[PDB]
Coordinates of C-alpha atoms in Angstrom, one line a residue:
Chain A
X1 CA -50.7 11.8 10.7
X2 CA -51.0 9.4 13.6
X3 CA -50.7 9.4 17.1
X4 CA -48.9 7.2 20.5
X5 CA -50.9 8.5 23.3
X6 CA -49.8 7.7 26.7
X7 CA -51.8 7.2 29.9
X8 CA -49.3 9.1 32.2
X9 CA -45.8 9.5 32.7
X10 CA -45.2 8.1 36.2
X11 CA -41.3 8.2 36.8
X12 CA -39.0 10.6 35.1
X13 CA -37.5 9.1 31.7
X14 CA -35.9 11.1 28.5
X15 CA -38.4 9.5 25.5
X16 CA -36.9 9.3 22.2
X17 CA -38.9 9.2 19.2
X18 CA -36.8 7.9 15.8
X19 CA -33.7 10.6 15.8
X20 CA -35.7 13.3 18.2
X21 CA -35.3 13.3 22.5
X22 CA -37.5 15.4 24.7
X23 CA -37.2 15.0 28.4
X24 CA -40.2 14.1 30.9
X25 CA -40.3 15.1 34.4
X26 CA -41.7 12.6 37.2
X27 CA -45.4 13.1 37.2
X28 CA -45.4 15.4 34.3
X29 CA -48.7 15.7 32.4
X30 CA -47.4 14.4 29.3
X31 CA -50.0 12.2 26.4
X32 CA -48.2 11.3 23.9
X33 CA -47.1 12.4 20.8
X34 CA -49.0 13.2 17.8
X35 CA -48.5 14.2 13.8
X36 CA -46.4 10.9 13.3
X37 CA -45.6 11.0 9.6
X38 CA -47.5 8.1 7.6
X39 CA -45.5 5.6 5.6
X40 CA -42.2 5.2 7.7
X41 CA -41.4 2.5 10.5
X42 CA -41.0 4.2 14.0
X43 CA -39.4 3.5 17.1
X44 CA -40.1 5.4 20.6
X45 CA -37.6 4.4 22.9
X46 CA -37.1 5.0 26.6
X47 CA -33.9 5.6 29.4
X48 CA -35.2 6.4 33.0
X49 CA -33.4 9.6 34.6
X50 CA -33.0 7.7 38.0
X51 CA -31.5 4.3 36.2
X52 CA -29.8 4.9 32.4
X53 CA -29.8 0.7 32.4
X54 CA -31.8 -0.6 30.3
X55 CA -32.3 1.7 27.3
X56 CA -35.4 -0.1 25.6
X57 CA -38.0 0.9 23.1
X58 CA -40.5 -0.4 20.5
X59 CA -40.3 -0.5 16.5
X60 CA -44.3 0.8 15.4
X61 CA -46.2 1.6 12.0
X62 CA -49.4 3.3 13.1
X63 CA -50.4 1.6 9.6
X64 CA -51.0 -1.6 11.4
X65 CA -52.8 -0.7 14.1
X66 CA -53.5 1.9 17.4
X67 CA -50.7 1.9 19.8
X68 CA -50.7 3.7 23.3
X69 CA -48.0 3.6 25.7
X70 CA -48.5 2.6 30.1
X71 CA -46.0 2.7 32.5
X72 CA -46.2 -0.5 34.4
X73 CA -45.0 0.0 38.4
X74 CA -44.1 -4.0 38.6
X75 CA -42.1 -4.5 35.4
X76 CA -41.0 -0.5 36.1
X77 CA -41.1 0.3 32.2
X78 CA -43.0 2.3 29.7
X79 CA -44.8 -0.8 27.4
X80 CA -46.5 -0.2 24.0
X81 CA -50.1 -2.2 24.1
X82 CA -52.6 -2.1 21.1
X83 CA -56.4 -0.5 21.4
X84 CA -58.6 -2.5 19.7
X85 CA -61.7 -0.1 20.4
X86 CA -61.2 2.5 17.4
X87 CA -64.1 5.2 19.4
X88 CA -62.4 4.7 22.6
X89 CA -58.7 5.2 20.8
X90 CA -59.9 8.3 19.0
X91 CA -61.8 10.0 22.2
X92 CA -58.5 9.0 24.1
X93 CA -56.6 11.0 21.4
X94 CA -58.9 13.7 20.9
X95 CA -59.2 14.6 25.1
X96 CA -55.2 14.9 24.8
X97 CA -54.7 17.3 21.9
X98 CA -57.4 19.5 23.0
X99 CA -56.0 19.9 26.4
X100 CA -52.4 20.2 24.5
X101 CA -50.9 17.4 26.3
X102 CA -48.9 15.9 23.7
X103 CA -45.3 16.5 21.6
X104 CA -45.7 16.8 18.4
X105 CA -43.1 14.7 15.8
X106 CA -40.8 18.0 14.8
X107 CA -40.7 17.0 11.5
X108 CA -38.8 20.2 8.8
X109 CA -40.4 19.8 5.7
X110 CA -37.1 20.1 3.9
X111 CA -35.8 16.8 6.3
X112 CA -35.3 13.4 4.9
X113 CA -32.7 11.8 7.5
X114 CA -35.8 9.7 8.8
X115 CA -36.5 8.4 5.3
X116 CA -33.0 8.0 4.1
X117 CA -32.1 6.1 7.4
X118 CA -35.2 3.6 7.5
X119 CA -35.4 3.2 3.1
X120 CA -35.5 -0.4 3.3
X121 CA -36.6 -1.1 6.7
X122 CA -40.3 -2.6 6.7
X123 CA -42.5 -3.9 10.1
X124 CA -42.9 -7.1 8.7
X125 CA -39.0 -7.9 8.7
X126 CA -38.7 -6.4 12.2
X127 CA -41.3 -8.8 13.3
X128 CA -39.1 -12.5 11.9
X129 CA -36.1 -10.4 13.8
X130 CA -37.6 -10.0 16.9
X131 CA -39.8 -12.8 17.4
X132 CA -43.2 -11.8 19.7
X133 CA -46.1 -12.6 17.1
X134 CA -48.8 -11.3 19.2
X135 CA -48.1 -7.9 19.0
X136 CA -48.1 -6.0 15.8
X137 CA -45.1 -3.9 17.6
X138 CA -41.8 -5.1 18.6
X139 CA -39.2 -4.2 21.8
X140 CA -35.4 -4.1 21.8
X141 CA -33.3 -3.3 24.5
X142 CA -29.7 -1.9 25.0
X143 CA -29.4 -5.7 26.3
X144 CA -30.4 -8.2 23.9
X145 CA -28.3 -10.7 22.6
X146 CA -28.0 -12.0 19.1
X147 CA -28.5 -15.4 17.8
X148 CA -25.1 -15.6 16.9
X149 CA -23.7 -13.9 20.3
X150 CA -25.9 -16.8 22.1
X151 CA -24.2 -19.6 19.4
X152 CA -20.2 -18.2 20.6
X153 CA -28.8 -17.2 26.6
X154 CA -32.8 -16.8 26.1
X155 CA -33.1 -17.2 22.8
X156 CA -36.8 -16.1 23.2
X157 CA -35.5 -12.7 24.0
X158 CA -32.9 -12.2 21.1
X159 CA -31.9 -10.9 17.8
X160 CA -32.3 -13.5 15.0
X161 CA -30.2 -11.2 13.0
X162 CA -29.1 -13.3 9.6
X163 CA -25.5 -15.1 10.8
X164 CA -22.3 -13.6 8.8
X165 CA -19.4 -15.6 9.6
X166 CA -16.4 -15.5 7.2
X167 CA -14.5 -18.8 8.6
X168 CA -17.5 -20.9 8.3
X169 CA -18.6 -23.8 6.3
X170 CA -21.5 -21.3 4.5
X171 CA -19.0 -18.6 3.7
X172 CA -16.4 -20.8 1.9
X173 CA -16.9 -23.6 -1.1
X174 CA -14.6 -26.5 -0.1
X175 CA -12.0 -26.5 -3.3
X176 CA -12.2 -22.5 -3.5
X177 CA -11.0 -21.7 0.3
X178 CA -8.6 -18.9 -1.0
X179 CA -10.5 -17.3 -3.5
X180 CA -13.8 -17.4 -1.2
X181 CA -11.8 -16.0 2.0
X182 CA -10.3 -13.3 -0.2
X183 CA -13.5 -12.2 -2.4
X184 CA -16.4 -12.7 -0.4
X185 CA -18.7 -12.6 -3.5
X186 CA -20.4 -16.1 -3.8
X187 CA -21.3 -15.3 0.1
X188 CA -22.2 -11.8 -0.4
X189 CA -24.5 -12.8 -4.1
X190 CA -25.2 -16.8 -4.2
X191 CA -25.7 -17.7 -0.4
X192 CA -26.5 -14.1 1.5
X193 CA -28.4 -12.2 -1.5
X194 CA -29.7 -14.9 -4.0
X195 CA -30.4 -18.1 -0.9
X196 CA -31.6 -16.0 2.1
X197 CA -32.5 -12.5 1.5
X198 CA -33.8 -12.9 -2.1
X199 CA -32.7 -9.5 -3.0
X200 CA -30.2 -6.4 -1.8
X201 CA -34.0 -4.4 -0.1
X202 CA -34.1 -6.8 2.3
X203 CA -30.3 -6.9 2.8
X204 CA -29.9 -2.9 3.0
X205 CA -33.3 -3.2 5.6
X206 CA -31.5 -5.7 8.1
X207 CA -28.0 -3.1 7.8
X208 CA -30.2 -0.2 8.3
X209 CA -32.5 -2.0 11.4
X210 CA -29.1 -3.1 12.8
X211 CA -27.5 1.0 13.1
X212 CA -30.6 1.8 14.5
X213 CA -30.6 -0.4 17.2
X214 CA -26.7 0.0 17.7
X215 CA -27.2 3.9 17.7
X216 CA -30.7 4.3 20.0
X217 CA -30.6 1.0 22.1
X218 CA -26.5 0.8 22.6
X219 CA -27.1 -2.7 21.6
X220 CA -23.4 -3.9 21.2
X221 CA -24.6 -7.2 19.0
X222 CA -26.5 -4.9 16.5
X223 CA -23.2 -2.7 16.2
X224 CA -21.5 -6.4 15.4
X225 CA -24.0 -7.0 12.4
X226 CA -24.4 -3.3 11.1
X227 CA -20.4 -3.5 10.3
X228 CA -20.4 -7.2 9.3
X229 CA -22.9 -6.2 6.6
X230 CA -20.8 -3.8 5.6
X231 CA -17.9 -5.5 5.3
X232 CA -19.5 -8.5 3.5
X233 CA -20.0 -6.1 0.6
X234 CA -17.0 -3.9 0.8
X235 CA -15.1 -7.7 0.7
X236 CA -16.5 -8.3 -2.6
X237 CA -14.9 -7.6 -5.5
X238 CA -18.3 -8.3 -7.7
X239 CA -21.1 -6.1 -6.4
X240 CA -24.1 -4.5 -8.5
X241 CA -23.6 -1.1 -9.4
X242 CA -26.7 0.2 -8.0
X243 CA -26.1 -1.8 -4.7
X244 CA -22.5 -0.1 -3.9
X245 CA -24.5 3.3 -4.9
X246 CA -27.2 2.4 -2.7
X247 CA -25.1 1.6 -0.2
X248 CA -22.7 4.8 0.0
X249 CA -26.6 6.6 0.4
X250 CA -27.5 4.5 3.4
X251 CA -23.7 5.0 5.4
X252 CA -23.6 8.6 4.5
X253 CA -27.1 9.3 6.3
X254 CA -26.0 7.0 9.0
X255 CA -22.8 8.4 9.5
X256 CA -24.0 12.0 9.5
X257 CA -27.5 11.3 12.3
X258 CA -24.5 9.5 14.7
X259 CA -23.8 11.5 17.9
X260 CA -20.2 12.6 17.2
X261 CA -19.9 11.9 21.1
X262 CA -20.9 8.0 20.5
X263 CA -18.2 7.7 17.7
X264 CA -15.3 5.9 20.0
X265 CA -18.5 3.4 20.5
X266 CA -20.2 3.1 17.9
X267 CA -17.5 2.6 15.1
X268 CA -15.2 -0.5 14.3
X269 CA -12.0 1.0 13.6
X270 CA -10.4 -1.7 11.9
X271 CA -13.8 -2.3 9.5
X272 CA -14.2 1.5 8.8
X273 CA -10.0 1.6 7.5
X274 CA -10.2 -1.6 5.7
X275 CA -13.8 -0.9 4.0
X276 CA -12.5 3.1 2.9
X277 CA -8.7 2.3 2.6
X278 CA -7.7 -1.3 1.4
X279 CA -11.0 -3.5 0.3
X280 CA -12.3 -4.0 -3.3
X281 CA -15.0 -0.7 -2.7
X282 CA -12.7 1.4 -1.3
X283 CA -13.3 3.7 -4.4
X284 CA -17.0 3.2 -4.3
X285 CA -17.8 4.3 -1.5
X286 CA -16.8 8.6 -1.8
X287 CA -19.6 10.1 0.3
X288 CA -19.1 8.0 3.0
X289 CA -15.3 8.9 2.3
X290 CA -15.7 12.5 2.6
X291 CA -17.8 12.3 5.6
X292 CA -16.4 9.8 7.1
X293 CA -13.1 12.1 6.9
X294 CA -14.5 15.6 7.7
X295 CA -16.4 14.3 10.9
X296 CA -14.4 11.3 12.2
X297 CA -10.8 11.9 11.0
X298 CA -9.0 10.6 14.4
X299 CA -11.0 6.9 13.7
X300 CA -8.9 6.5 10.1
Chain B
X1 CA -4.4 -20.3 22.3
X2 CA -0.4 -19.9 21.2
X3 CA 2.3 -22.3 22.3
X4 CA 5.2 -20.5 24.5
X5 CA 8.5 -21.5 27.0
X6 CA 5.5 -22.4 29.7
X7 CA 3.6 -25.2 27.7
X8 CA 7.0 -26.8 26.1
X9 CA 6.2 -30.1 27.5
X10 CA 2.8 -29.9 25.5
X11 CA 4.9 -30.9 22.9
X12 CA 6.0 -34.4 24.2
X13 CA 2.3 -35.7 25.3
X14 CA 0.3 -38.5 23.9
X15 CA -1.7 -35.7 22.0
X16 CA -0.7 -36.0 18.2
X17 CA 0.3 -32.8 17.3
X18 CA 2.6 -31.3 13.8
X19 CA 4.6 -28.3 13.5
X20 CA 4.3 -26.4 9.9
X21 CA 6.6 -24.2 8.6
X22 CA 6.2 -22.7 5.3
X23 CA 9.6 -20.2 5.1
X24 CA 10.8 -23.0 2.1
X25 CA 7.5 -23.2 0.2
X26 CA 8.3 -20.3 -2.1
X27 CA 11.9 -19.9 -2.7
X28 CA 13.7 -17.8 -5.5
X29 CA 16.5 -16.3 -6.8
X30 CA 16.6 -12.6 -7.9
X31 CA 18.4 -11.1 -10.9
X32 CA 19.2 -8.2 -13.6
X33 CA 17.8 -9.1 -16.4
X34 CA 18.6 -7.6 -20.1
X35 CA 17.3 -4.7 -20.0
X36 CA 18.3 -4.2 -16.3
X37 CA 14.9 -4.3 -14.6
X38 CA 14.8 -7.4 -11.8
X39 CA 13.3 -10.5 -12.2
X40 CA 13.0 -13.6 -9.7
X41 CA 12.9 -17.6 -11.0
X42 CA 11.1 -19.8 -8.6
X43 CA 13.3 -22.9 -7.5
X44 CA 11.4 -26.3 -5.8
X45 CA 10.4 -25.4 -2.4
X46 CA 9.0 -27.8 0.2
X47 CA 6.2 -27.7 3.4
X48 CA 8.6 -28.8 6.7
X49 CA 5.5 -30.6 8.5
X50 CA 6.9 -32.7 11.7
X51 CA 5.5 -34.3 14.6
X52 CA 7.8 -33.7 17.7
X53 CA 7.3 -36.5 19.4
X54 CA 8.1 -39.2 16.7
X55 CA 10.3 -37.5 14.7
X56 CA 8.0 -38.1 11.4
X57 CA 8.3 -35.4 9.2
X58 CA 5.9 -35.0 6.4
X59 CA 8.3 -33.2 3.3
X60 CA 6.0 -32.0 0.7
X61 CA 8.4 -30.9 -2.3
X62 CA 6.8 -28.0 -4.1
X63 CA 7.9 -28.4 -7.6
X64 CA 8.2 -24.7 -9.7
X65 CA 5.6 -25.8 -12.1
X66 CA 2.5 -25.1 -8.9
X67 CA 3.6 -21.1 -10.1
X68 CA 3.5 -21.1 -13.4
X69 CA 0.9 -18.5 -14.1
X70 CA 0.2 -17.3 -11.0
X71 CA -0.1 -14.0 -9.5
X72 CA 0.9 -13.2 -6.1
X73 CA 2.6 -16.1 -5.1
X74 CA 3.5 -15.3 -1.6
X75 CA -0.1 -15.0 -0.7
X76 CA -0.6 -18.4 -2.6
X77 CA 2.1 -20.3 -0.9
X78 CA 0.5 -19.8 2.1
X79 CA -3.0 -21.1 1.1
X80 CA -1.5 -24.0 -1.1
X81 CA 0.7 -24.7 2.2
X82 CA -3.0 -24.7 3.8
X83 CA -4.0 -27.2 1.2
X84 CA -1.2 -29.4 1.2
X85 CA -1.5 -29.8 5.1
X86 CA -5.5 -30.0 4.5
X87 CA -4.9 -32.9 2.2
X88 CA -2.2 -34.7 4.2
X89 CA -4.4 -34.7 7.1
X90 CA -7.7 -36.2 5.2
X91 CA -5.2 -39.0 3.9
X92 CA -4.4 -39.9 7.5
X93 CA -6.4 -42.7 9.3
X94 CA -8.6 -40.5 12.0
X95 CA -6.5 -42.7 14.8
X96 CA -3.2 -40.5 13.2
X97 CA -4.6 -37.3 12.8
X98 CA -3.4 -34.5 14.8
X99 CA -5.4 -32.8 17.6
X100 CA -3.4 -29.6 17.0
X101 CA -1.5 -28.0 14.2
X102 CA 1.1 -25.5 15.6
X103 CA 2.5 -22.9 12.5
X104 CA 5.6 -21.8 13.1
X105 CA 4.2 -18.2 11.2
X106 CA 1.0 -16.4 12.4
X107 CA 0.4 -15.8 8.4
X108 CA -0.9 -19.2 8.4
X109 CA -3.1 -19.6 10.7
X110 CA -6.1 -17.9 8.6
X111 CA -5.0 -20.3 5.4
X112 CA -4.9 -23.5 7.6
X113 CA -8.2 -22.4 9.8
X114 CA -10.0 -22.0 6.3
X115 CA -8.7 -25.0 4.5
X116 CA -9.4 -27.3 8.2
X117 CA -13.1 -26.2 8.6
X118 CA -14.8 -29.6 8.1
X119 CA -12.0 -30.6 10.8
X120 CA -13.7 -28.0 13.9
X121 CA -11.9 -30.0 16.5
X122 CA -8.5 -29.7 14.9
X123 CA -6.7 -26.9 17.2
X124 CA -4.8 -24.1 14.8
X125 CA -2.1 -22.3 17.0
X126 CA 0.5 -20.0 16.7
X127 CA 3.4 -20.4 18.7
X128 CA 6.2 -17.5 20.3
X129 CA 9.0 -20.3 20.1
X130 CA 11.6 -18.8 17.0
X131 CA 12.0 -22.2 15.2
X132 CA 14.7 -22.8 13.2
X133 CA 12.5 -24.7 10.6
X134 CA 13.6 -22.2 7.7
X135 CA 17.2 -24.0 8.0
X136 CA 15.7 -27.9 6.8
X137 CA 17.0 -27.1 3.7
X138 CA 20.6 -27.0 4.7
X139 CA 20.7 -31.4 5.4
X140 CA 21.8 -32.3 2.4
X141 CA 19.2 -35.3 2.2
X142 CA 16.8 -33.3 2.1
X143 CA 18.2 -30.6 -0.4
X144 CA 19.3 -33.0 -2.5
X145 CA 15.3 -34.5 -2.8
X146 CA 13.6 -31.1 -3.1
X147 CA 16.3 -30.1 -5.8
X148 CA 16.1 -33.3 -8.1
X149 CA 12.2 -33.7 -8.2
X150 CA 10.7 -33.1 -11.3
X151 CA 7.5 -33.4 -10.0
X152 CA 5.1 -32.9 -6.9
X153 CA 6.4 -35.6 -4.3
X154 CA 5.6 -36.2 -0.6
X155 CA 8.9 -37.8 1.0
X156 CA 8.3 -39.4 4.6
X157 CA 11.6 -38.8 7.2
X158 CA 12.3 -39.4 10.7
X159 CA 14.1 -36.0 11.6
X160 CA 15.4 -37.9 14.7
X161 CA 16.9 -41.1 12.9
X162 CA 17.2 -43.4 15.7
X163 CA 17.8 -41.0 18.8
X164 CA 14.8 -41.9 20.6
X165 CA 16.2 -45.5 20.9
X166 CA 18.6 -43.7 23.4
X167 CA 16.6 -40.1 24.2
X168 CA 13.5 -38.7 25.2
X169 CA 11.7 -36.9 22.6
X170 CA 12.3 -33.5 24.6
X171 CA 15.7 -34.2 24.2
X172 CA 15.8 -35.1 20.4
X173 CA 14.0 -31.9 19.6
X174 CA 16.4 -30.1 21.6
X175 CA 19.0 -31.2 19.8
X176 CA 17.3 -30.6 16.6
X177 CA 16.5 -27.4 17.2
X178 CA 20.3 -26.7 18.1
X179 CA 21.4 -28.3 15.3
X180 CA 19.2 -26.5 12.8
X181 CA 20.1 -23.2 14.8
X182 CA 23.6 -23.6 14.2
X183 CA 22.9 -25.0 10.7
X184 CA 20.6 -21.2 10.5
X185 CA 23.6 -19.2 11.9
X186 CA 27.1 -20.7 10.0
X187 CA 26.0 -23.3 7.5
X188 CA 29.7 -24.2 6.5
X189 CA 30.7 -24.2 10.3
X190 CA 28.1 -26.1 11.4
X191 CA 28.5 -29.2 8.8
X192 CA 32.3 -29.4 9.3
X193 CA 31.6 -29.8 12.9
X194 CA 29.2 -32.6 11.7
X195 CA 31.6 -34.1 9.3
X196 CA 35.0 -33.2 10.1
X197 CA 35.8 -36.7 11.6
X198 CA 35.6 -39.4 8.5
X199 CA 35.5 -42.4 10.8
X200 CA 31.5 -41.4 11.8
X201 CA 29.7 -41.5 9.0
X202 CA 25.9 -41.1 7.8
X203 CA 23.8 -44.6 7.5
X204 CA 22.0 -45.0 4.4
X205 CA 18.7 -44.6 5.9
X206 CA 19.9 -41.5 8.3
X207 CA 20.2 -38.0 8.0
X208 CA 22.6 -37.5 10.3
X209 CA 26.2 -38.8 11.5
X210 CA 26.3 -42.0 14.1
X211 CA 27.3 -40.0 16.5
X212 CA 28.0 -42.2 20.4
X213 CA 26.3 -41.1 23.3
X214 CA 29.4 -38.9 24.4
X215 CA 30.4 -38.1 20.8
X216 CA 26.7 -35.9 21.0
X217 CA 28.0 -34.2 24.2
X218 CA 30.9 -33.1 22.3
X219 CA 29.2 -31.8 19.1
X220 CA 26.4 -30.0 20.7
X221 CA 29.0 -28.2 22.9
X222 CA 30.5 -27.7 19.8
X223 CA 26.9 -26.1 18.3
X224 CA 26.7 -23.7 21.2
X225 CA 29.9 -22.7 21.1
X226 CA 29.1 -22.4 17.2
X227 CA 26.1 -19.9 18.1
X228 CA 27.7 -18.0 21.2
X229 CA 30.7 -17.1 18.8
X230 CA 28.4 -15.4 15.5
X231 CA 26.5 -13.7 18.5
X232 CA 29.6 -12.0 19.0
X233 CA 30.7 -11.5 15.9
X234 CA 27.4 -10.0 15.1
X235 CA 26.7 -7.6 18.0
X236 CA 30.9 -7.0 18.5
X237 CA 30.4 -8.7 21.9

């Protein structure tokens, strides 16, 4: 189990760690948090009490190296830095548990939702997403913009989030305009799956990064791929079995971890009815169906 | 965005521009058949494609055989309207090709915007005008060609014979438009107005009669009185 020390907590901020949320006071003496479970991506993510702009935070796998979190006072934010002393890291560490200074990751044994919502999500995708390649740790904010937000404007600081367009010259053979616009297969399994993704893992990992960052950052282009993604599939009437299964696993754990509260936000209305209701899935899909309908039934 | 009553004028600029209308690409007639269930049999259709401000009309007849053994064929006329207006527009010199496609239904602006991809600076609009388009199919020149054809045909017309020798083009599609209203409301009505006098006739290479410049006062006074009286008729006004 690994550990995110931090030097101090400076200014008063509620710190989010994948689906948990504990609040700091101003000056607190709070270190960190320890007993990160092993073989998952992370996020810890940050909204200051006195300004709720900018939520921002940093995708992580203590696999790839020691990570510690300092506020800066110039910048005013929390940044993730690497250690590259190993002795100092672990005395760092050590100092802070003894003195009981950090939160531990309240992990129940018997709890998969961080699994089931980060399957397919790996740091090294992350990383061609959000381009920063000298850290081994990437930041998103409730403000970046997407490569294809930016096309319709630093695009050092955006999303390069794969483009999904359906009236556009990739989505659509010239001679088969109808029967491309109306079954979005040959995008979905030549051009998306087969040409740029190479198979549905990496496909299902750029869906699952893109709720995350729609759910913990309130990033409002992120929201815009997560449903495309979905509706690229759900507009196909040729879709591997094992994909459409997959994929009523990864909405139904997403659907479930949402604040009910965010719903009217974080949902597309018109995707969500025609995806359940009227498109080539809608049978496929039935536990996203049911809880879809037991916790959201005003949306449909 | 869509063309209204504030940008009418649009129309009449030097910006080439064509109207489609689609309301005559699929046409049938429903029966009983012998067991009593329903059936429909497609008759030819056409795509009503016109350019305001010349009067050139584009008539693309639709013959029954582009159905045969097709499913859903209101959702195909629309994208073979699409690629019909796709086509006509890739056969036009790039000097004739419109800058904006107006489509008199908003059912085809998806079709058209697909089909006019590799054309990105081709405007696809709607429009809140009600056209009276549908009613094309009530001048008998252009009946009688989209009934006889035995084939797919593209027939070239000028909708405004030779008006704009004497009019502006605002004015000839005004008086379109309120003849293929009145032509919309009372067919039978509307062409006796047209031919009830034997001494004006249709020329050969015209659609409609010879009518003198005060001879057109009189008929479309004739037209609105036409419409006014089915407005009352209909709503017991």
């Amino acid at each position: 189990m690994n550990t995110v020390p931090f030097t101090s907590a400076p200014i008063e901020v509620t710190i989010g760690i994948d689906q948990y949320s504990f609040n700091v006071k101003e000056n607190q003496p709070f270190h960190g948090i320890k007993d990160i479970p092993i073989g998952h991506v992370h996020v810890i993510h940050f909204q200051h009490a006195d300004n709720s702009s900018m939520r921002y935070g940093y995708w992580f796998d203590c696999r790839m190296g020691n990570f510690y979190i300092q506020y800066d006072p110039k910048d005013g934010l929390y940044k993730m830095m690497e250690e590259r002393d190993g002795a100092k890291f672990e005395n760092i560490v050590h100092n802070f548990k003894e003195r009981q200074m950090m939160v531990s990751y309240p992990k129940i044994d018997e709890d998969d939702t961080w699994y089931n919502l980060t399957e397919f999500v790996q740091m090294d995708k992350i990383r061609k997403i959000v381009r920063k390649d000298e850290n081994q740790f990437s930041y998103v904010d409730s403000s970046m913009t997407t490569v294809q937000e930016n096309e319709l404007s630093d695009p050092a600081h955006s999303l390069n989030y794969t483009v999904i367009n359906f009236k556009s010259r990739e989505a659509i053979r010239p001679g088969h305009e109808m029967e491309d616009f109306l079954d979005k297969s040959y995008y979905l399994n030549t051009v998306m799956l087969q040409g740029i993704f190479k198979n549905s893992s990496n496909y299902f990992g750029e869906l699952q990064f893109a709720f995350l960052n729609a759910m913990f950052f309130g990033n409002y282009g992120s929201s815009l791929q997560w449903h495309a993604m979905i509706e690229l599939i759900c507009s196909s009437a040729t879709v591997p079995k094992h994909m459409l299964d997959k994929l009523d696993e990864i909405l139904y754990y997403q659907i479930k971890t949402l604040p009910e509260q965010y719903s009217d936000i974080l949902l597309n209305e018109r995707v969500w009815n025609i995806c359940l209701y009227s498109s080539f899935q809608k049978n496929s899909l039935h536990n996203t169906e049911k809880i879809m309908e037991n916790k959201y039934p005003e949306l449909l | 965005g869509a063309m209204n009553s504030s940008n009418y004028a649009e129309l009449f600029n030097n910006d080439i521009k064509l109207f489609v209308d689609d309301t005559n690409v699929y046409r049938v007639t429903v029966h009983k058949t012998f067991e009593g269930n329903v059936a429909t049999k497609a008759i030819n259709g056409c795509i009503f494609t016109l350019n305001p401000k010349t009067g050139h009309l584009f008539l693309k007849i639709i013959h029954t055989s582009v159905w045969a053994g097709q499913k859903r064929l209101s959702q195909l006329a629309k994208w073979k309207t699409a690629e019909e207006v796709s086509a006509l527009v890739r056969s036009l010199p790039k000097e004739e090709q419109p800058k904006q496609i107006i489509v008199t239904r908003k059912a085809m602006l998806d079709p058209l915007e697909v089909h006019m991809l590799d054309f990105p600076n081709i405007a696809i609009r709607p429009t809140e005008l009600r056209l009276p388009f549908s009613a094309a199919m009530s001048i008998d020149k252009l009946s009688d060609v989209v009934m006889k054809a035995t084939e797919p045909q593209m027939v070239l017309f000028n909708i405004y014979d030779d008006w704009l020798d004497r009019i502006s083009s605002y004015t000839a599609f005004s008086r379109l438009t309120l003849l293929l209203r009145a032509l919309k409301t009372n067919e039978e009505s509307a062409k006796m107005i047209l031919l009830s006098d034997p001494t004006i006739t249709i020329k050969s290479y015209h659609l409609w009669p010879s009518f003198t410049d005060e001879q057109w006062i009189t008929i479309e006074s004739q037209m609105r009185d036409l419409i006014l009286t089915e407005y009352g008729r209909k709503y017991n006004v």
